RNA sequence: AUUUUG
């Protein structure tokens, strides 16, 4: 499964998550599940271009995810 | 369930803001509704006007609420 | 499917997607999930403000249409914009 | 009598479909399924603002795009009687 | 090992929740399920409007999971 | 069905349902099903003048999917038993 | 012509993805799954309202919003 | 992955 192989090859690395709203999250991908729910370590949140938040750990509900991109 | 409202006059508020007033005839497990003798009531502040509309089948996902009258 | 897509095989059809995008194209293939293959596709572009059509089109060639986002399918032959009946 | 049973019983008769974005489709119900997917014949498509109109010989409507359906009261009577 | 564990380990903790409609919650997580429905106790809500923020307080608040964007455990 | 049971325990108590369309309805919870559809009785609409069409409504049904929040007054027994139940599900399921 | 076979024939080549919103992606198709979530590499992302473009080395695109998949990439 | 967990 191509999506699963990509995810397994970026787990533990730093990724860009874009949500359908366009809000961005940069962080270390801990794990994901079948709904594309995500767990991120060391997370920076970006609205438009500005960093708005940081989280040591963040749960992202998978229905919001537009894409997961290697950094 | 909605069986308690069957054959009663109800107002149905839809997600797009419409107010339908009619007799609830039936429903199913999606809360799809079937209404008879329905009017659509158009509000501007506290004033309203009615439009006769007949029978509706309302898709459940668009139903915000159903109120007994 | 209640729609027998083979009746449109090699005819131009109009497709509308959830969100408002509209295209036309010549039906070359489909599956049971209503994914389509359309050829000579043209997209009717919309105004960013009103969401209404502008009259401008763009060509897109051979396109795979996702059945999950299809909301409307209609043959082009017999269609016409008309005045308020 | 369930909503979708009424819908199946409306096959062959006029129907009004309003989509979630306010477009309306007037025409004869050709077919329908349990998703509420519809096929209509002899269709008038009215755009949301009520501005532009179109005629379509037939069309397919995916069920999860529908806001509501309107049918003639006479249909409900004649279906109750049968 | 799975993302929902972050929520599991956050039980009885003050969590931060980001919700659709420009809403934010801060509150003690008392329960949740696989939809991310949850109940928060002693919860503050920040509603952002376009700039300006409205603050609200709830003794006990059920949140439907389909509005949830992000959950963050406490620091 | 954790929250279905929680809401069962709130039956005949007062709650306030905030809909995703921003309306808020206070009333007595009379019913809840597996989809978290709720029935309220003796309702009162917050900012009622803004929603004139609700003035003549006494009882109502609300589809679970349009609910944003249900909020109510706290009770310690409620809170600790709810947390206990969540932990019980997590040990079991 | 079966739609998904055409997509599979595009693996290794350029593919232009058009979302329901004013957003597009064009890049080399690495692969896809049963819901046509898509892995693209050496990708350009387009905001077709602002005209801003971004680059990505490799990404998994959620198939939920995809209206159109155009083999051969974008002109 | 076609209405109550997008």
Explain what the structure shows.
The PDB classes it as rna binding protein/rna. The entry lists the keywords RNA, RNA binding protein, RNA BINDING PROTEIN-RNA complex. The complex is a heteroheptamer. By secondary structure, chain B is mostly beta strands. Chain B contains no helices and 5 strands. Chain B has one domain (1-69). Chain B is globular, with a radius of gyration of 11 Å. Chain C has 85 residues and is an all-beta fold. Chain C has a single domain (1-85), classed as SH3 type barrels (Roll), CATH 2.30.30. Chain C is built from no helices and 6 strands. With 93 residues, chain F is of the alpha+beta class. Chain F has a single domain (1-93), classed as SH3 type barrels. In chain F, 27% of the residues lie in helices and 34% in strands. Chain F contains 2 helices and 5 strands, in the order αβββββα. A 5-stranded antiparallel sheet of chain F has the order 4-3-2-1-5. The chains are: A mainly beta (71), B mainly beta (69), C mainly beta (85), D alpha+beta (82), E mainly beta (75), F alpha+beta (93), G mainly beta (75). The interface between E and F is medium-sized, with 21 and 26 residues.
Question: In a few lines, what is going on in this structure?
Answer:
The complex is a heteroheptamer. Chain A has 71 residues and is mainly beta. Chain A has one helix at 2-10, and strands spanning 14-19, 24-32, 38-47, 50-60, 65-70.
Chain-wise SSE layout:
The complex is a heteroheptamer.
Chain D lengths: L2 H7 L4 E6 L4 E9 L5 E9 L6 E9 L4 E6 L1 H8 L2
Chain E lengths: L3 H5 L5 E6 L3 E10 L5 E12 L2 E12 L4 E5 L3
Antiparallel strand pairs in E: 1-2, 1-5, 2-3, 3-4
Chain F lengths: L1 H8 L4 E6 L4 E9 L5 E8 L14 E3 L4 E6 L3 H17 L1
Antiparallel strand pairs in F: 1-2, 1-5, 2-3, 3-4
Chain E binds one RNA strand of 6 nucleotides through loops.
Keywords (chain A): Cytoplasm, mRNA processing, mRNA splicing, Nucleus, Ribonucleoprotein, RNA-binding, rRNA processing, Spliceosome, tRNA processing
Protein name (chain A): LSM complex subunit lsm6
Subcellular location (chain A): Cytoplasm; Nucleus, Nucleolus
Number of domain units of chain D: 1
CATH topology of chain C: SH3 type barrels
Q: Under the CATH scheme, which architecture of chain C would be assigned?
A: Roll
Rg over alpha carbons of chain C = 13 Å
Helical residue percent of chain C? under 10%
Give me the count of strands of chain C. 6
How widely separated are the two ends of chain C? 32 Å
CATH topology of chain D: SH3 type barrels
Largest interface: E-F, 21 and 26 residues
Q: Tell me about the biggest sheet of chain D?
A: 5 strands, antiparallel
Query: Strand share of the residues of chain C?
Result: over 45%
- Read across the widest sheet of chain C, the strand sequence of neighbours is 4-3-2-1-5
Oligomer: heteroheptamer
* Element string of chain D (H = helix, E = strand): HEEEEEH
Q: Give the helix/strand class of chain D.
A: alpha+beta
Distance between the termini of chain D: 12 Å
CATH architecture label name of chain D: Roll
- Please tally the helical runs of chain C, counting DSSP H or I stretches of 4 or more residues: 0
Q: What count of helical segments of chain D does DSSP give?
A: 2
Q: What is the CATH class designation of chain D?
A: Mainly Beta
Main beta-sheet annotation of chain C: 5 strands, antiparallel
PDB class: rna binding protein/rna
Keywords: RNA, RNA binding protein, RNA BINDING PROTEIN-RNA complex
Assembly: octameric
Entry title: Structure of S. pombe Lsm1-7 with RNA, polyuridine with 3' guanosine
């Amino acid at each position: 499964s191509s999506p699963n192989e990509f995810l397994n090859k970026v787990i533990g690395k730093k990724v860009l998550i874009r949500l359908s709203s366009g809000v961005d999250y940069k962080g270390i991908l801990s794990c994901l599940d079948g709904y594309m729910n995500l767990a991120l370590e060391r997370t920076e949140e970006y609205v438009n271009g500005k960093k708005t938040n940081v989280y040591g750990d963040a749960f992202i509900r998978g229905n919001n995810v537009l894409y997961v991109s290697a950094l | 369930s909605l069986v308690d409202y069957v054959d009663r006059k109800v107002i149905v508020v839809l997600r797009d803001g419409k107010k339908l007033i009619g007799i609830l005839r039936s429903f199913d497990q999606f809360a799809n509704l079937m209404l008879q003798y329905t009017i659509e009531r158009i509000y501007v502040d506290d004033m309203y006007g009615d439009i006769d509309r007949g029978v509706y089948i309302v898709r459940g996902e668009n139903v915000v609420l159903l109120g007994e009258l | 499917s209640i729609l027998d897509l083979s009746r449109y095989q090699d005819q131009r059809i109009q497709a509308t997607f959830t969100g408002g995008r509209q295209i036309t194209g010549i039906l070359k293939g489909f599956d049971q999930l209503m994914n389509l293959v359309l050829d000579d596709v043209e997209e009717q572009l919309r105004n960013p403000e009103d969401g209404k059509l502008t009259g401008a089109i763009r060509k897109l060639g051979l396109v795979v249409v996702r059945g999950t986002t299809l909301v409307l399918i209609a043959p082009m032959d017999g269609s016409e914009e008309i005045p308020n009946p | 009598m369930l909503p979708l049973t009424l819908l199946n019983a409306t096959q062959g008769r006029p129907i009004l479909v309003e989509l979630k974005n306010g477009e309306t489709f007037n025409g004869h119900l050709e077919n329908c399924d349990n998703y509420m997917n519809l096929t209509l014949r002899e269709v008038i498509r009215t755009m949301p603002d009520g501005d532009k109109f179109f005629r379509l010989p037939e069309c397919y409507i995916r069920g999860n795009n529908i806001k509501y359906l309107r049918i003639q009261d006479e249909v409900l009577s004649q279906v109750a009687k049968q | 090992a799975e993302p929902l564990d972050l929520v599991r380990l956050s039980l009885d903790e003050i969590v931060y929740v980001k919700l659709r409609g420009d809403r934010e919650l801060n509150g003690r997580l008392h329960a949740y399920d696989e939809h991310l429905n949850m109940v928060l106790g002693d919860a503050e809500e920040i509603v952002t409007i376009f700039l300006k923020t409205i603050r609200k307080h709830y003794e006990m608040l059920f949140v439907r999971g389909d509005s949830v964007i992000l959950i963050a455990p406490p620091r | 069905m954790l929250f279905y049971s929680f809401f069962k325990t709130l039956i005949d108590t007062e709650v306030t349902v905030e809909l995703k369309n921003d309306m808020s309805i206070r009333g007595i919870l009379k019913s809840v099903d597996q989809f978290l559809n709720v029935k309220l009785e003796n309702i009162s609409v917050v900012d009622a003048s803004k929603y004139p069409h609700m003035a003549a409504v006494k009882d109502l049904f609300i589809r679970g999917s349009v609910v944003r929040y249900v909020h109510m007054s706290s009770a310690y027994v409620d809170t600790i038993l709810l947390a206990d139940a969540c932990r019980r599900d997590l040990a079991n399921n | 012509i079966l739609p998904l076979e055409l997509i599979d024939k595009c693996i290794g080549s350029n593919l232009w993805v058009i979302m329901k919103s004013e957003r597009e992606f064009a890049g080399t198709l690495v692969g896809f799954d049963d819901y046509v979530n898509i892995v693209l590499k050496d990708v350009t992302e387009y905001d077709t309202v602002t005209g801003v473009t971004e680059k990505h080395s490799e990404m998994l695109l959620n198939g939920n919003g995809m209206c159109m998949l155009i083999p051969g990439g974008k002109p």
